[PDB]
Amino acid sequence: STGSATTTPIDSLDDAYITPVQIGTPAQTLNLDFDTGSSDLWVFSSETTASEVDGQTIYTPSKSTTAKLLSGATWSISYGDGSSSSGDVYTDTVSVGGLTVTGQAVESAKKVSSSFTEDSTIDGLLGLAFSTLNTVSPTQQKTFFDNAKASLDSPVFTADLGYHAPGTYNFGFIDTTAYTGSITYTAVSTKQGFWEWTSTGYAVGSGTFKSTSIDGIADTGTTLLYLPATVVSAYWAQVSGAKSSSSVGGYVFPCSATLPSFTFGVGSARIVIPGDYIDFGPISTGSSSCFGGIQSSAGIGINIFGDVALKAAFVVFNGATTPTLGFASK
Ligand SMILES: Cc1cccc(C(=O)NN)c1
């Protein structure tokens, strides 16, 4: 089997991407945020505290003939941006792009934090990191990909995120028409539950390539590119007027400035992030100060290849017995 679904930015800045997901019988279609940095599939639901729901589409398990309470199960998750959600669990049929899993753990939110309430476009998350990060207790549950894996033609999924445009998640196959050149594969550590790998270095604009190991995660659920402070300083030093602002919480620049590209290494291969990808617009409406898409990972504890980086590439998440990551230009 295979599946193929279109993923769509939620706003004009590509702050996140939503993918339609069919849950239950008859199908309830929810728009979920596919997140290779977490491992819970959770949704706004009929059980979510009423005051915390504002425009989201909800899953109602009582209306699904295939929904079964996972008795005694609870879940509770906190994300890197300080947001959080929690609730109980049902198993139900879940389909993505024609690929169907039965008995998928669907985590029903009883509580979500303010940032989820305030974003009407995201109806929940679909985690695609390793199942060892799943928060369901007392019995940890498997991700959609983990459950689908044995049935897939090939044990892989791919992320092809668009720049200010729709893209694609495929399951079970590699679309050889979706990238240029070759796919370069690189080693993955699963020890922290993430798609964790080591970049071979970077360059800024037309600058020479600095060979240096940068350990980080491929994380579709994170908007920006977070790298060591040395690397980020070297990037913004090439942008006239750029400054790190403690009041804003990162690097900002005048948008009258032209942004250089940023290149990262994948083995001997190179992925080039165009300068325009690194522009996240005015810090507040009407402001001439724009927020940077490359920020310091200092204090996060880990480097994060988020959407800014991944949308410059065709990315293979290879879930073979020994997992690997593949990157191609496109
Ligand atoms: C590195 C890290 C730490 C905490 C949460 C996340 C996550 O959920 N990413 N989408 C990632």
Side-chain angles (χ1 to χ4, degrees), residues 1-62 64-67 69-110 112-141 143-190 192-242 244-330:
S1 69
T2 60
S4 180
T6 296
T7 193
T8 306
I10 64 166
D11 58 28
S12 68
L13 297 174
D14 304 337
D15 279 321
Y17 299 77
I18 47 173
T19 311
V21 177
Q22 282 68 52
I23 312 175
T25 309
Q28 305 181 37
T29 299
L30 272 67
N31 297 327
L32 306 184
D33 183 353
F34 282 24
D35 179 14
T36 63
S38 63
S39 302
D40 287 50
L41 195 174
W42 75 259
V43 296
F44 278 78
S45 76
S46 57
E47 307 183 321
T48 311
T49 302
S51 64
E52 301 185 339
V53 181
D54 186 15
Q56 292 82 13
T57 291
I58 60 167
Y59 169 64
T60 305
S62 73
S64 173
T65 57
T66 39
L69 181 71
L70 193 61
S71 186
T74 55
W75 62 277
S76 181
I77 197 167
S78 320
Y79 298 99
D81 65 343
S83 65
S84 70
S85 49
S86 60
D88 50 21
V89 188
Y90 296 83
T91 51
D92 209 342
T93 301
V94 171
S95 294
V96 173
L99 169 66
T100 299
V101 166
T102 57
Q104 174 64 46
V106 176
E107 304 171 31
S108 168
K110 302 185 101 70
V112 301
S113 63
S114 59
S115 69
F116 286 114
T117 302
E118 288 160 4
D119 180 12
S120 66
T121 71
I122 291 180
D123 303 322
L125 264 67
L126 189 146
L128 294 171
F130 294 90
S131 288
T132 54
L133 289 178
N134 178 264
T135 76
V136 177
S137 175
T139 309
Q140 187 174 67
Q141 300 293 301
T143 69
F144 173 82
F145 174 58
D146 217 335
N147 283 323
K149 183 178 292 178
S151 300
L152 293 177
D153 291 358
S154 183
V156 305
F157 67 92
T158 64
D160 181 9
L161 301 180
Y163 166 66
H164 294 174
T168 304
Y169 281 102
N170 294 327
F171 293 84
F173 73 103
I174 288 159
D175 181 358
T176 60
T177 72
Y179 57 89
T180 61
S182 56
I183 304 179
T184 294
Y185 289 86
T186 194
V188 160
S189 172
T190 62
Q192 286 185 109
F194 300 120
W195 292 92
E196 188 177 0
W197 62 291
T198 299
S199 177
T200 46
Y202 70 100
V204 177
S206 61
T208 51
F209 185 86
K210 174 84 175 168
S211 281
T212 186
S213 295
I214 307 176
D215 186 290
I217 68 172
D219 182 4
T220 56
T222 289
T223 309
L224 307 179
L225 175 53
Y226 296 86
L227 290 170
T230 50
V231 177
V232 176
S233 184
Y235 176 82
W236 290 108
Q238 301 302 312
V239 181
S240 157
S244 178
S245 169
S246 59
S247 73
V248 177
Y251 282 90
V252 297
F253 67 102
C255 267
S256 56
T258 296
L259 297 181
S261 62
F262 185 88
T263 300
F264 63 94
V266 185
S268 55
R270 305 293 180 244
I271 302 294
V272 176
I273 303 167
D276 287 344
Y277 290 29
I278 299 163
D279 178 11
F280 281 73
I283 57 184
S284 296
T285 299
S287 176
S288 69
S289 180
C290 297
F291 198 66
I294 295 176
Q295 300 292 347
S296 179
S297 66
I300 292 174
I302 193 154
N303 298 305
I304 307 177
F305 294 85
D307 297 336
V308 168
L310 301 180
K311 73 182 167 191
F314 177 89
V315 192
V316 182
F317 296 76
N318 171 25
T321 314
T322 305
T324 62
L325 269 176
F327 292 83
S329 296
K330 63 186 189 194

